[model samples]
Target chain A: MKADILLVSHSKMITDGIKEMIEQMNASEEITIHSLGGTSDGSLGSDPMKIIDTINEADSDREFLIFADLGSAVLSSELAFDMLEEDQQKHYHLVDAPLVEGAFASAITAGVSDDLTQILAEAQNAGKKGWN
Target chain B: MKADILLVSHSKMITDGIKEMIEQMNEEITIHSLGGTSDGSLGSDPMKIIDTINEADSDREFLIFADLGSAVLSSELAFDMLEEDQQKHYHLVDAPLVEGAFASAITAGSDDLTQILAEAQNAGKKGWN
Candidate 1:
């Protein structure tokens, strides 16, 4: 699998909305965009276990660019990252970029380049660009 | 004057990164995406939001976009904390994250606060459909 972007938010509305917007932007078709929002009961909070589950569900061969919405979302992703094998942990990135803009940029950049280094750089830049 | 976006997050990396990314997109605008906390931990700081609002173009209107959790509540509190006159210049937008920021960022280049807000709301709704 190619590089993928994971979007986590407390609200499905946000995760779903960002997914649609990224698609509308016609970003990289090669890079997949995944949404992991809300909790098991569809509540407004993130569970580290759910994040870990999604990380496992993603294409293991590819690297991940993860964007979190808020507090637990960030903390949970960190927890999920820790759960992975040390080597596997290197494959998953918890980006400091905002969910909507960062994911949008990642989607476009991932399509343009398969290089994880370049992809990470571009994703970071996109976060800055989106915010400005 | 064009509308401006206020990005409020608990991570400086996020706020700053998003700001730079949007700017690199050649989106000409004024944006303040305040991230992190007073002690540099994760938190939606109303003080930062307050400072951002105070620093903005006093004559132009503002559109505030926040992430979930404290971001939402803090942004609201920040708005309420403002003087009545300052309150009129700011609006707390309840649009979806990322999508709303992108939509608002792009639309802000050419539209007023009202139009930008409408476009952001539309973008969020569009995301659902």
Candidate 2:
């Protein structure tokens, strides 16, 4: 319930575009969306540290579940995550997937309380090889 | 890399467009591609709780690391992931991102080793803020 979410994408334009869609759709919902813009480079921009900073700033208490655009991106951000405090690490869960699609998929499985893991499982199944 | 990757878009041609780019360039690369057709509805797909009594047939493994467009889908699949023994649960690694973008972004941090984890870190950083 006290989870702050971060979305990492190629550019701000792309990131924001996806954020806006989630916001507009989840307006009545209760999930916070934080965004970081980068190009997956060595310094600044998509640097692992940069993404970590955004999420850290978003939820210093370590109640943020992170989601990245690609698996690799999530992995990098996670690598940066290793440098954080244990408390912070406890709160960080990388559900690395798509931004817009993940958001939309989460919306579909948002039944009962906001138990994110259940929602995530539902979304994953939908995107996989079945349920056409 | 003989496995083909499919990107399911809200729109179709959208799927193809992403495919085109990967193909055109990955031509030099080695990965097979296969795409399924459908929404995440209940019917010919996405249906769990049903036991497939095919002692004669099965997927490539008892474990498949399936990535969903969202966490819910993944979770749903995880719930149904009870078919195999806990020890056999090691076939899939859900790393779903975008079609066109996840491909490009992951390309950024192509962490040598061809280790997907290394590749994933390299790519995830490129995409997220």
Candidate 3:
């Protein structure tokens, strides 16, 4: 069940920070953290499609989750999600829940280990209400 | 028309980089560069609204232009745009023309120095096809 969760976010440090918390709780391997760089502030940031491509590459039977730090992250994620294959889309989820909840936390509570439909439901729910 | 041009993107380095080029070309101060920080990469990034609010505060009865670097930057800017007032909406433009052209370059060629209607038309034209 835990094997299915994934965390995709814009900042490496922020993602690492959240992952650190997740690891400290001893649930480190429960979810995968995909950190998209541009953190160095050089080269005008990364091509966002790279993150989407990484998500696609994961293609696990379990659900995928995404949480972006800022507006650009959200916008880029949406565009990337739209670019996915229909079946691949099933494995991907963009958690609109704010960064405060941490991308991994949002992804986990949203059912990354559960079925796709269930995970997605939790994703939407978490997006609006956040982790409770 | 010059007063209305706005460039919105993700990185201060990139934004400043673009602005630097613009200034070097001797188009200095022709367009304002609003760089959003989080450059130091600590405590997460800044909320996107600060950039938009800066734009809103600069609502000078001219056209507004935006060019975000990445998808998140685009998403954040769109959300901010939706939050703005309707009258203020008229001045805003999210230039989807890609960075190679330069946000200010796209806005200007599209008519930042011209009438508002002309510039907006240019914005759309640059976006698709």
Candidate 4:
């Protein structure tokens, strides 16, 4: 199986949007994607606690590549990463790029690659070249 | 709606993979996944590709990414099939199908067609640093 995805955003739609797109690609089997969007009231903010919980709850056998939106979405994800136990931290990697576009390229890369590093590059590169 | 991508491959799988991958980046750009021969074989249908290029969304330019040698020939054939004006708008970007499309989709969302084409051509030229 390929790596999994954890999408973090301040809005639920942002995360769900990526998950649904992944479904359309028919890549759900190889790379299991998860969305961690918003809070219980559905506000425009993220919670590190929830992120830590999601990471703890995910499969230990699988690695997770994270793609988050800007600002709080990223800060919260980083905070959550710090909260993780040393062992759980190994299963996770956070990439810097726009959420949807980054994840889209990442999911496809993950489908064919066993290398998590390569997959991270796919997402990171998507935004790095988001220029002239 | 932003610019669109016409993914050309010998098999439908590559096109679909590229298109789906683009969706992960968000739906800013519309992606048309075109692949296979007339009989669902491992080749491109130049005529079919022409049809996708001729599809609605007239105002938007299309960036085409072909998978292999013959697929590129088929992509070129489709471009040749278009009217002179139509052909100019359809750019056959020289990049690998997946990586080119992967980078193009993101760039297509915001950049003009010229910049988008430049980005795709550079997608495969980077060294891992």
Candidate 5:
């Protein structure tokens, strides 16, 4: 099954920049990539409700993987995840990886595979590869 | 006139990673980085943040770049712990960790807080002529 990816960050510019880079990399048009960055007022902060809404809007048939920058992003993602039903939550994966690097790697991997498990593994290892 | 920077993050790896990257770019300035909890867990500690802030040069302005989660909360708590007059010397910038820190470090030699803050916040904005 296909999967959706979420890029979380405190700076809209960072998330937006990553999104553009991923698209330019030709990572795969088949997958839907979403961004949950900053707050509603465009300030630097994360919003759990926004994340919950995004997860709800994603393709229900596909699984979900989130790459978040910093601690609040992770906490917000968890809050969003908790709002979902048990069955719905089961399809989601929260990864611990460097934001920019992990998001890029995961986007590229998404182009070749729809396996969320494998994608998670690849994204998690992205930090180990180091940023050259 | 050079402003000292503090990079706050939940994961030590993230903060340490960024610190190493910045040092390689330039070593003239020193940046104080605080990540993880006092117990070495995945979290931030306000006490450590306050202690780090105390170690900075009081005469120079301080620029803080915090990651998401409790890092912000911890930074805020630490900021509040400062004296009323001391509060004016510190600024908690709203920017991304990696890009913001890199941008700040690059312009830190300028020692201009406004210029540094501008550069840091603009780190996320891609594309240029």
Candidate 6:
């Protein structure tokens, strides 16, 4: 198993939707996908503490790939990352890409290869570039 | 202008994000987004989807792009809510949410419905490389 991927969004729907999308492809069989979407009340917002709890609950040895939707979600995820103990913080990676497309393409790519670099590359390029 | 484009995703973040993304190209297409459950939770609301469909331009046809799974399912359900005669104007596109929106919206208003639909279909079809 590789580093777990966390999907963050203002609405849990986006995170959950992408997770189901990757799982439906059976492409993320190796790495588990978790979501930190919405506030505790199930409304449209993100909470840093929720993100922290999710990260702590995951595998300790491997690093993390965190994808977020929109600016504040990214901010909240970062707030969670910042709260991590120094050692733990190093294991978390904040990725930049569209919440859905980038995460889907990268999650499936990670399903095939263990190389995080390659996976991020695929993710970052998901809806951009040649777009051929 | 062509028919309006509707974007459906589980989260309004996904729907709105894609719309803002397409605007980078600044195409003059009228795109509307519907996301999240009626309660604004992690799901799609067919009822809202129906309202959004009717909320769009009545005279123009519609091209819809849904994210996947439940969003797509809800979009379909919402489509069924339409009157039989009204259903013909709505077309559910088969393409990934992001790329299809990029492909479809760029040509949405500039091209006709069939031409924009083909653009979205091209985004879905294999061998673009």
Could you estimate the TM-score for every candidate?
0.53, 0.47, 0.40, 0.51, 0.53, 0.58
Q: Which candidate leads in DockQ?
A: 6
Q: What is the lDDT of candidate 2?
A: 0.42
- Per-residue alpha-carbon lDDT of model 1 for B61-127, expressed as tens digits? 7777765455777888897899898898887776655556667778766645667777666443211
Candidate 3: tens digits of C-alpha lDDT, residues B6-91: 44433343344445544433341345444343552212132443444444544444333333223234434444555455344334
True contacts kept of each: 0.05, 0.07, 0.00, 0.00, 0.00, 0.07
Clashes of each: 19, 48, 10, 4, 3, 1
A71-131 in candidate 2: lDDT tens per residue?
A: 3445666686888778777777666445545555655455344686776654343323332
In candidate 5, what are the lDDT values of residues A73-121, reduced to their tens digit?
6678777887888888888777766576566667777778767777777
Per-residue CA lDDT of model 3 for A35-107, tens digit only, reads 5634335232334576566766764564566655443545666777778879877666565443323343444
For model 4, residues A93-114, the per-residue Cα lDDT tens digits are 8776556556777887777888
Question: Candidate 5: what lDDT?
Answer: 0.68
Worst 10 residues of 2 chain A by lDDT: A123-132
RMSD per prediction, one decimal?
15.0, 11.2, 11.2, 8.4, 15.5, 8.3
DockQ of all models, two decimals each:
0.06, 0.07, 0.03, 0.05, 0.03, 0.11
Which residue pairs overlap in candidate 5's backbone?
A71-B69, A72-B68, A72-B69
Worst 10 residues of 5 chain B by lDDT: B120-129
Tens digits of per-residue lDDT, candidate 4, B8-51, equal: 65666546544554575456677887776677655668887777
Candidate 3 lDDT (Cα, 0 to 1):
0.42
lDDT of 3 at A31: 59
Which candidate tops lDDT?
Answer: 6
Off by over 4 Å in 1: A128-132, B1-61, B64-129
Q: How many clashing residue pairs are found in candidate 2?
A: 48
- Give the CAPRI rating of model 1: incorrect
TM-score of candidate 3 restricted to chain B? 0.44
**B46-103 in candidate 6: lDDT tens per residue?**
8876776666666767777776566777777777789876688888886667657667
Selected candidate, larger lDDT, 2 vs 4:
4
The candidate 1 chain A region of ten consecutive residues with least summed lDDT is A123-132
Deviation in Å, model 1, residue A80 alpha carbon: 0.7
- CAPRI classification of candidate 6: incorrect
The TM-score leader among the candidates is: 6
